[PDB]
From a paper:
Ubiquitin (Ub) is a small 76-amino-acid protein that functions as a post-translational modifier on a wide range of substrate proteins in the eukaryotic cell. Because Ub uses a common surface to interact with a wide variety of proteins with relatively low affinity, it is an attractive scaffold for engineering variants with greater specificity for select targets (Ernst et al., 2013, Leung et al., 2017). Using this method, we unexpectedly identified a dimeric UbV that is selective for the RING domain of XIAP (hereafter referred to as XR) (Gabrielsen et al., 2017). Using solution angle scattering and X-ray crystallography, we show that a single substitution of residue Gly10 to either Ala or Val is sufficient to convert Ub from a monomer to a dimer.
To investigate whether Ub74 G10V resembled the UbV.XR dimer, we determined the structure to a resolution of 2.23 Å from crystals grown from the dimeric gel-filtration fractions. Polder maps (Liebschner et al., 2017) confirm that the electron density for the β1β2 loop clearly extends between two adjacent chains such that β1 interacts with β2′ on a neighboring chain to form a β sheet. The dimer interface comprises around 1,800 Å2 of an overall accessible surface area of ∼6,000 Å2 for each subunit. The main source of divergence between these two populations arises due to differences in rotation between the two Ub bodies in the dimer subunits. The populations differ quite dramatically, with angles of 144° for AB, 159° for CD, and 163° for EF.
Residue numbers in the entry:
A (entry chain A), B (entry chain B): 0 to 73
């Protein structure tokens, strides 16, 4: 009869396949391919630091099964 | 070649087909059908007010194409 919309906000953990030498920028692109989030809205955080696009995961000693935090720009 | 995890707060907006006389409990039942969230783990919000199970969409003046907000609770 009638349609309503429900906007949901959940805690979600995504898994990515990466190389220690991938840049933060390449990681944001992989997040886009999986979530449809453009890279310019993505803020990636590890151990309290904002991750810089032009650096690699190894630059931040992001190892296997490390967990990044993704926060979106408003 | 490694696996990493990215934890994010993800926004998903769902559409529901309802009648103005549907109870909130009936609406949560439809959310379960489409997202698999049981009604007691659902915190359903309209216009900043938490919606009560025994009340209808009309009671809260929820009209066509209205948007509700949902977060998960234990």
């Amino acid at each position: 009869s009638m349609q309503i919309f429900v906007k949901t906000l959940t805690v979600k953990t995504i898994t990515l396949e990466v190389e220690p030498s991938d840049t933060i920028e390449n990681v944001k692109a992989k997040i886009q391919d999986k979530e449809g989030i453009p890279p310019d809205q993505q803020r990636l955080i590890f151990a309290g630091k904002q991750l810089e696009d032009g650096r690699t995961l190894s630059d931040y000693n992001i190892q296997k099964e490390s967990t990044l935090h993704l926060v979106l720009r408003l």
